[PDB]
Amino acid sequence: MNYNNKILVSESGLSQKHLIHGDEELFQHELKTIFARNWLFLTHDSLIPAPGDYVTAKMGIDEVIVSRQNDGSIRAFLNVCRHRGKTLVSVEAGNAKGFVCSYHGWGFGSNGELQSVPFEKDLYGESLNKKCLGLKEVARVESFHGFIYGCFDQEAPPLMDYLGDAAWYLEPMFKHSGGLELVGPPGKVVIKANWKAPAENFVGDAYHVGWTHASSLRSGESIFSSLAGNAALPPEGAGLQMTSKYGSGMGVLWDGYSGVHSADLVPELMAFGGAKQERLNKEIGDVRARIYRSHLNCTVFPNNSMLTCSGVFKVWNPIDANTTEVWTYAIVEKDMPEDLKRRLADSVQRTFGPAGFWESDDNDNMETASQNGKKYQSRDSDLLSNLGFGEDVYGDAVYPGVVGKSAIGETSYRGFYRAYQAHVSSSNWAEFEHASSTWHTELTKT
Amino acid sequence: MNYNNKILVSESGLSQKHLIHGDEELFQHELKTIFARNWLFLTHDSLIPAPGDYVTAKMGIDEVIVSRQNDGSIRAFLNVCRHRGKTLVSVEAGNAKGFVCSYHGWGFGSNGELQSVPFEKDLYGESLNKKCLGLKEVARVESFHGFIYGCFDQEAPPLMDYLGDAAWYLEPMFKHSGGLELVGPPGKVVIKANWKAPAENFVGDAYHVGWTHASSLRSGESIFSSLAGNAALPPEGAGLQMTSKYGSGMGVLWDGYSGVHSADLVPELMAFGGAKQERLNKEIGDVRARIYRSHLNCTVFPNNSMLTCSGVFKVWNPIDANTTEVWTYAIVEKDMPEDLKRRLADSVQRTFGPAGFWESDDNDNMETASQNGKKYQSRDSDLLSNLGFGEDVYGDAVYPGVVGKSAIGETSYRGFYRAYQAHVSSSNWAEFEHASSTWHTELTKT
Amino acid sequence: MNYNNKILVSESGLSQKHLIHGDEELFQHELKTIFARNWLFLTHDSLIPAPGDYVTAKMGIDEVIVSRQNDGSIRAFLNVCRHRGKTLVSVEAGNAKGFVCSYHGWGFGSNGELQSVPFEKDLYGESLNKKCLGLKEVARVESFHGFIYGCFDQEAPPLMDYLGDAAWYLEPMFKHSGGLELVGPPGKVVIKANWKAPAENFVGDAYHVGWTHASSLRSGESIFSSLAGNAALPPEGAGLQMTSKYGSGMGVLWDGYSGVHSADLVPELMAFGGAKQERLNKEIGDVRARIYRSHLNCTVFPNNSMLTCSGVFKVWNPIDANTTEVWTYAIVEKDMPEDLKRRLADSVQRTFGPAGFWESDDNDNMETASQNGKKYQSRDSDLLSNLGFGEDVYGDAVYPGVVGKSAIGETSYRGFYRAYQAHVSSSNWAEFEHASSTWHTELTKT
Amino acid sequence: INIQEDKLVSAHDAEEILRFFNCHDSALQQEATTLLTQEAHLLDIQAYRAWLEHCVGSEVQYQVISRELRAASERRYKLNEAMNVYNENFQQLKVRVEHQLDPQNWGNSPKLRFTRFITNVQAAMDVNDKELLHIRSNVILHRARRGNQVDVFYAAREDKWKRGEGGVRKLVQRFVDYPERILQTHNLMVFL
Amino acid sequence: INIQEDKLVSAHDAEEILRFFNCHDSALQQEATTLLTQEAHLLDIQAYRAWLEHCVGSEVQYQVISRELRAASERRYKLNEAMNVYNENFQQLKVRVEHQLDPQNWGNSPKLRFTRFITNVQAAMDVNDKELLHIRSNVILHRARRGNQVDVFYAAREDKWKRGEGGVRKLVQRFVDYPERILQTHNLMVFL
Amino acid sequence: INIQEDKLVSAHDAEEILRFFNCHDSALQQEATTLLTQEAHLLDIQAYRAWLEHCVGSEVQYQVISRELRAASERRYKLNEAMNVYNENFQQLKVRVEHQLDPQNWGNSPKLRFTRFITNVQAAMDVNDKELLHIRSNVILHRARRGNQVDVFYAAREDKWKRGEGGVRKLVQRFVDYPERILQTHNLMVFL
Ligand SMILES: Clc1cccc2ccccc12
Ligand SMILES: Clc1cccc2ccccc12
Ligand SMILES: Clc1cccc2ccccc12
Ligand code: FES
Ligand code: FES
Ligand code: FES
Ligand SMILES: [Fe+3]
Ligand SMILES: [Fe+3]
Ligand SMILES: [Fe+3]
């Protein structure tokens, strides 16, 4: 397949070829043009707060060690020994001043440097140039209010610029709330879906909620429960959708601070969020204080998703075209009482974790949609994302980005796939920029 | 591999490259040139007799919904939602006026039409063109005496013409017997063989019976039992072989109406078939009345096989070059007493079903022959099908098709693989026809 | 990938691209340029001593039958029926005058000839040319002191020449000891590593022993135990490394006759080896008599390894780039008391067999190093084998081959990979020879 | 069990629960465990004739079904719900045993290896036939052959056992509703 | 057990060994076996309401954890060692049961098939609460659905059971430390 | 069993059937079940020293073989039929235990997870040595490590147990004929 020429996503992001969820050659191509090029979620400050603390993370199919340095910074390195390529670290988290390889005993520092080689003097003499044998380092590591992302491509935009118009929506909860913590360890489960299936679902799919999650809505009695079985459509002005230049987007459901949490947490959460909102009105204005306590379903392009307020935080780690390893953390507000943090974390896992009853509702939808992308008669078929097309705006006086002023639509699919297609057909960041110079115009056509 | 030029099957079908049973690129090519082009078995009238009745079926690696329409016709559609590609139907059979997608709730009629979209007015307004969003329909659906076949290629010959000279042999049992019923549900088992291995075996392999099935012949005491361990060769005139232009073929074993059924069914069956034969003499002539009660081992090209009289009916559903999902039904004559139908159906499964002791004799033969096609030193080796070559005829006054007037031979292999090679090397039906304009001459050479 | 041009192994064998352990296209290419071209271990005289005795063996991914002929020679044939390609032999060893196919009953002799065809006269008449239907024969089968190797390529050097400078080191134990026996049956286990990972480890990796095998050294109390946890470096003159033109190489650890065997066998073995050494001094000289009772870790290129004295004998049978089937036999000296042979064989399996506690220490090292070769950021990375480079010699007056006069180094890696690269980039033996005309000069540079 | 409330429960399954929840006889559970362990031992060592002689009653029905996947809400489609993978009388079992023992059963060389794991044994006497013993048990059956073929079967067995010749308890009915619709074990050629 | 000598043994695991090695009561082991076999039967037939009513105490904590992989020698890193795949009170179990029984749970059509294998049963009364029964058992749980989906779960269960309404013994605590860190079963949506 | 009639049965297997079919002692079967469940618990928590001390006799032979695949009709080829995956005396078991416990056994970090399922227990006293107890049982052994590595082992165990120090019954022989010829579990580094 010629990725320069092949139209995998049609103009304005209106449709995508079904093969994108199934084609292994394209998956391999995505490793280069999506995962090696873009910002990928690694960890949070709260999980590696002290010098020497480390975790392992996936970046695409690669594994990295992410380590807190003595100077308070974070550096990340391929989890691969520079001698004969053995995996250096076999655990998920810990604290160490370095990592010793179990094959021939080479010792690397937390700073990636090759610090020791067994019997170096007797074996290598002065001939081993250890300065050139440091672990292969992730070129870019940056923080968004404690959330640490990495990028293999030195040419990438800064993380803040990469978030584009999405940052404005995230800031009330990520910054102005006083800050979030990530509660680990994550749940980890393999699903037989393409990574794009859950990514597209979290970035922009409010339409599926009442039908897919009918049973979970009816059974849990959460605040979005009026939607069960499509019994009721959200009122006008219930929410909006947005998307951005580099592909990140989200839905906003106004005031939905208790999110998917069952009735057992609803009064406590609605009280807590409302109280902080009242304080935030004076600081960031009424609209942004309201966004803080509104439910955001967001994907940070390409494969990091979240539900703010519900507190669900996801990494869709790619394995092959029909295999994804799902990591699920809980996000909590730092100034919540500890007992509330604990119950919120359990509730995140109860609903969206490995035995998350909501997340289970999505399995067959994601898996079969992905697997059908391999089927002969479906490869060249068109997946539709035209809902709301012709009603999106850009440059609004109140809400930034490409915005659909309605709670349910496919605005954020279009922006996600527009960015996806621009990357797949480009050889570097400069070419992506050239391919994106009229990004919002393309999305707001008709 | 260049499929226009590569000789995968030698002249007259005398040999085939062993790689055909193992090569995944060729498997992918077969999806296009074999499965998307030819007639494939779907279901029987008896399984979807009433309006709204449906089943799911495989066509190649694709899955379809096959539905009885209100007007009595049958239409078949890809089991894939037109919105974002989720599998619509998760069951094997049922009765419904339509199918609703579990993802966003789109509702399709039994006629494939997009009939309803949740909250269409509020979400899409008048902008969704539902007329253009019907399920992707199988272009051709036709019946041979209740047996329903589908074809994705609008350019295919009518099913009756596609059966070619094989139809004449099938008609006494399929038509003149008063009609057959398919007894479901089928057994379903995955074997680690290429679909062509069992297809070639059923189309033309009488040679294997005495040796492969020695233990089953010796243990069950069926009427073909004299063959056990190659203890005896069938007498002259015990049978014949035939093949046809579009690849279908069969063996005929004269008078073998009780087939593989153990001694417990032999007297009852031999009485029943003989009685109907006596009535049929007056209607269709002695030869054709005798064919009715003769055992036919047949493959309807490419991947549907049967043993008439034994009542075994098979679909060799392709998964990959070394994986096939075997579906096994029983066929019964409609005018048999119900208790006989029940016992015959159990006996079909007893011998050739998931725990079929006869079918088990074939496992290692099919699986290893297929898997050896991947082995480096065997890929370019030649599988032989020359038995009986130089003694076949065409245009015989009594028996139509390319015919080998002997019970054991490889006539039907040659016709099967001649058609296979003509398809693999052709881009469409017109090219297949051009490649087949001297089909019988090629088969009767020397 | 263009294998004529791609530098997979750098000059002097100093490094290799990590992708060599993971790339499936290269694996397929190795089937042609490594496994179909080179000498591969089959069996030992001791396992097929009598006429009619046979075993099955893998040669690359192919399976062969290896049979003792009536004239005392050994011939080997593809385990594939010449009719329709069924696997002929389903057992691992036995005694027979021939092999009958379970599909249509064709009967082949122990000499590979097609001897019988069921009902040949009635079916084929005189038309089947059985003389041309013998099993596909392995072109070359040769013995090194009872150890039987096969090669599919008629153009290969004789086995003795192929062993090159390695033969001199093996002869004291393989020949002058009075001869070895292979004790079967082998252990068989699948590991998720590339075949080159254990091959490179046995050919030249003394560096890993103290660290990788720290626990086994500390727990078993074998004679190499001073190495546990890198507590001590072997003294100067403790050993040497060697490599050869066609890729075979080994380490020599002076005097280590009890090898990995636990303290329960040490005194008995050290007595036995020392006594035979005293006799051999007069026959082959002091140096070679000492080599006899010195521990050799050797790979016979490409995928046969051994530890002499320890008595471990390995075949790393390739399955795919990250899958290898490990066969483990014990080697014993024929003139050892039978009770010692029995205990030595059990000890080989105890340490290096399917539950070999030493071999288990290597699992993660081999598997992760191999699997990392598939990871995107590691494919184009460089595996290092530069230890000792610039200190190797050739043409030494005492020790032949390219020799590193030190116990721990990477000399034998360099020779292994130099030969590997010359094969991968060559179309035949003549081209390999042309690519190897300055083999020792390349290895002794700087 | 009220199957109107417990919506996922079939009438058949509710009936079988009722059978074991009442007169619990500990000695009977232990007799049943011995009986099934001995049966499994005979099968595992491929003593199929001994199995017939010692474990299988002359009036046996040995039945394993495969049920077609239908909608939970289905109420109209009425055609045959299941097929019989096995539905054997004693003579039919004997045929299968002779097939296993035949020296020209090429698939049995090299010799297969079977290992059975029997758990969750429950036993209750029939209410109306005081000589009929209901036994429920679950089986994992591991079959290994030809170096690297491994097939694992999983099933619940609803048995009836009755005292026959010499007072030896023998199987007069086995019913298995096989839980996997599409077999991934090459075949179901094992005695569950 | 001396965990200073038996270096691989956790303090928690050593405590649980101690519990069963002392007063062995054979009758109690058999009562526990019946209790667990009946519980598994109810779950296998998807009688989830009956399971709650007959097997689950009002004060239950039903907990399945997933422990982060850490170095054997780790002594400094102190953050949350595990997450809760399940950590349910009775009301939370009831929510999950209603979710299973809801006619719009699309994933439950066609009906799932469950088969549970309960082994290694041990039972001991609590020393301080003579009405508290400790039961340990291992489970293999086989779930089959949709033709060719097969998921097999493996776990050890540390239970506490206590006599409740009508004197019926009911589960008041289940603790499972799930042995596989990354699930390869699509989800853990089964009651272990 | 008549192995001339039951053609697939080995003389060894027929001898072992005979052992359990005669004096059935229910109490002995239950003692054996406790003994094996406790042994499996010790192994599962990796209390290998406790296992040696409490479960393993000084005179033990702990043996697991792998049998070469040969023709069912083979009568001429006479060479070594099997190799020993394990064939350990007490000291050799101790070496393996020390290897497991060594802090430089890199493969044991992060800590492995074991779950064993013991079923089909049969027990009979030896006829000639009234202090020798024959115990047969089957094991499924699940080993999970490093996120996504899962290996499952299946085997029948022929044991002899005898009263040793303090009157504690200990293993004096274990024999396993491993059913899979080519292991698909990376290694057999587990105590069956
Ligand atoms: Cl809970 C919720 C609301 C809106 C959109 C969503 C998308 C994905 C998952 C949950 C969502
Ligand atoms: Cl039973 C029988 C007779 C003749 C040919 C056959 C081919 C395949 C299967 C069964 C056959
Ligand atoms: Cl035991 C031993 C010594 C030296 C090198 C070795 C390489 C591989 C395996 C064992 C070795
Ligand atoms: S591979 Fe890491 S030290 Fe050699
Ligand atoms: S995928 Fe079917 S309604 Fe959306
Ligand atoms: S395949 Fe061997 S005789 Fe036909
Ligand atoms: Fe969802
Ligand atoms: Fe057959
Ligand atoms: Fe090693």
Author numbering:
A (entry chain A), B (entry chain A), C (entry chain A): 1 to 446
D (entry chain B), E (entry chain B), F (entry chain B): 2 to 193
Lines quoted from the article behind this entry:
Naphthalene 1,2-dioxygenase from Pseudomonas putida strain NCIB 9816-4 (NDO) is one of the most well studied Rieske dioxygenases; it is an α3β3 hexamer and is the first Rieske nonheme iron oxygenase for which the three-dimensional structure was determined. The α subunit of NDO contains a Rieske [2Fe–2S] center that accepts electrons from the ferredoxin component, which originate from an NAD(P)H on a reductase component, and transfers them to a nonheme mononuclear iron at the active site. The catalytic domain of the terminal oxygenase is the well described 2-His/carboxylate center composed of a mononuclear iron coordinated by two histidines and one aspartic acid inside a large hydrophobic active site. NDO has a relaxed substrate specificity and catalyzes the dioxygenation of many two-ring and three-ring aromatic compounds to their respective cis-dihydrodiols.
In the case of 1-chloronaphthalene, NDO dihydroxylates the nonhalogenated ring. The C atoms on the same side of the molecule as the Cl atom are in the closest proximity to the modeled dioxygen. This results in the formation of (1R,2S)-8-chloro-1,2-dihydro­naphthalene-1,2-diol as the major product and (1R,2S)-5-chloro-1,2-dihydronaphthalene-1,2-diol as the minor product. The structure of NDO in complex with 1-choloronaphthalene was determined to 1.5 Å resolution. The Cl atom was found to sit near the entrance of the active site in an area that is relatively open.
